[PDB]
Amino acid sequence: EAKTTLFCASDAKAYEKECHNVWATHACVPTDPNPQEVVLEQVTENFNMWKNDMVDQMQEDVISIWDQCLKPCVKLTNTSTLTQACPKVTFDPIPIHYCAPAGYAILKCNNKTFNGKGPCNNVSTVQCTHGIKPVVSTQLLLNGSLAEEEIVIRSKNLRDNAKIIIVQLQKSVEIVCTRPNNGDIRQAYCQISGRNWSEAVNQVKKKLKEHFPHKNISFQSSSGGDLEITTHSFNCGGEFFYCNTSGLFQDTISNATIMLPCRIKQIINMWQEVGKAIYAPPIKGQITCKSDITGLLLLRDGGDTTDNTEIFRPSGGDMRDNWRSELYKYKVVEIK
Ligand SMILES: *[C@@H]1O[C@H](CO)[C@@H](O[C@@H]2O[C@H](CO)[C@@H](O[C@@H]3O[C@H](CO[C@H]4O[C@H](CO)[C@@H](O)[C@H](O)[C@@H]4O)[C@@H](O)[C@H](O[C@H]4O[C@H](CO)[C@@H](O)[C@H](O)[C@@H]4O)[C@@H]3O)[C@H](O)[C@H]2NC(C)=O)[C@H](O)[C@H]1NC(C)=O
Numbered sequence: 001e002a003k004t005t006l007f008c009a010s011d012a013k014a015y016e017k018e019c020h021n022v023w024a025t026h027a028c029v030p031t032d033p034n035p036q037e038v039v040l041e042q043v044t045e046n047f048n049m050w051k052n053d054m055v056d057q058m059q060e061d062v063i064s065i066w067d068q069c070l071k072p073c074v075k076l077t078n079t080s081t082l083t084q085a086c087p088k089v090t091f092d093p094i095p096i097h098y099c100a101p102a103g104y105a106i107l108k109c110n111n112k113t114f115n116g117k118g119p120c121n122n123v124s125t126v127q128c129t130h131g132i133k134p135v136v137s138t139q140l141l142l143n144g145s146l147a148e149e150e151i152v153i154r155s156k157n158l159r160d161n162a163k164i165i166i167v168q169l170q171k172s173v174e175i176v177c178t179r180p181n182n183g184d185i186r187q188a189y190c191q192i193s194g195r196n197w198s199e200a201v202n203q204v205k206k207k208l209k210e211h212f213p214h215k216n217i218s219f220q221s222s223s224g225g226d227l228e229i230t231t232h233s234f235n236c237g238g239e240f241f242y243c244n245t246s247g248l249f250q251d252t253i254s255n256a257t258i259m260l261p262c263r264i265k266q267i268i269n270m271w272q273e274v275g276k277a278i279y280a281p282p283i284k285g286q287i288t289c290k291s292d293i294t295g296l297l298l299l300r301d302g303g304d305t306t307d308n309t310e311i312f313r314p315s316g317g318d319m320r321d322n323w324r325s326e327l328y329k330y331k332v333v334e335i336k
Pocket residue numbers: 016017018090091092093135142143234235236237288289290291292
């Protein structure tokens with residue numbers, strides 16, 4: 001159980017102008033062409049997704065990616081003002097693998113319902129993690145991995161309402177967000193199957209109810225905070241989308257097609273550090289991301305629930321939680 005400096009590996013192509021590729025060609029080595037996995041027999045190891053230095057390293061790398069790929073024109077902090085060249089770039093996240101250096105291995109939990117904190121009974125050793133897209137978002141976790149058997153609820157302590165709940169879905173729900181070619185260059189929309197979304201919500205609700213027996217599970221919109229957190233926010237092709245999810249986080253959801261209104265914003269509250277980053281107006285043309293919703297970030301309301309209802313609202317903002325949603329099954333160990 002030691003802290004070491006992981007290295008990254010990817011399939012980035014040197015000819016590719018896409019920024020994640022450009023960053024990874026310099027920062028990472030090539031993906032392991034022949035990866036070996038060794039099942040450890042009759043072995044139990046403790047994992048803690050909430051105290052895992054792998055998360056802090058990924059955070060540093062995504063910050064480094066965004067420093068190259070999403071350079072704001074103006075960056076404001078309470079101690080600083082920066083004005084700089086801010087060219088548009090080609091942006092589409094690629095998978096990144098995190099790898100143990102010599103004298104260290106990465107243990108991988110293979111229990112398919114492991115909650116991320118406690119003993120794992122089916123462990124194997126790997127050199128590198130599977131490829132993980134560094135997708136930055138709030139509310140909905142996009143383009144990540146699915147739970148194999150059932151929905152998994154992950155929290156440092158479910159009884160602490162202040163702690164984020166990471167939900168991992170078993171079945172993904174598609175979301176297509178589009179700023180059409182064109183009147184209002186900042187208006188966009190997402191389309192999602194209400195049938196599929198509603199089924200996901202119902203399954204997540206049933207899993208939550210197992211931890212709050214005799215309580216009715218309600219989903220509601222965020223109580224307040226920055227727009228990054230009160231909307232589903234993500235970057236699509238270099239543009240910052242803010243998508244209203246009032247249609248999603250409700251107790252009555254239609255089985256028809258749901259349309260979410262979105263805005264593209266130039267002024268964003270940064271996740272990397274406290275401050276504002278100001279970007280140039282959106283590129284021309286159709287901007288579209290079709291993504292798989294593979295998880296949720298939820299916060300449960302605190303206080304006496306007079307109604308016998310537990311209320312859950314979408315949340316996010318600390319992108320370490322995004323990385324935890326993928327790194328929960330891994331831990332770095334010193335071989336000897
Ligand atoms: C979640 O994950 C999904 C994928 O799993 C992401 O969706 C992908 O988004 C990328 C880019 O945003 C898509 O790739 C782009 O596709 C464009 C069209 O591709 C079709 O048409 C071309 C041309 O005929 C075919 O060759 C191709 O096979 C497809 O049939 C391309 O035009 C793009 O390439 C262009 O720009 C690049 C920039 O580097 C240039 O190098 C190229 O020369 C070219 O000009 C690009 O390849 C991809 O298709 C999407 N996948 C799916 C399944 O939709 C989501 O964006 C992601 N969500 C988030 C939030 O990150």
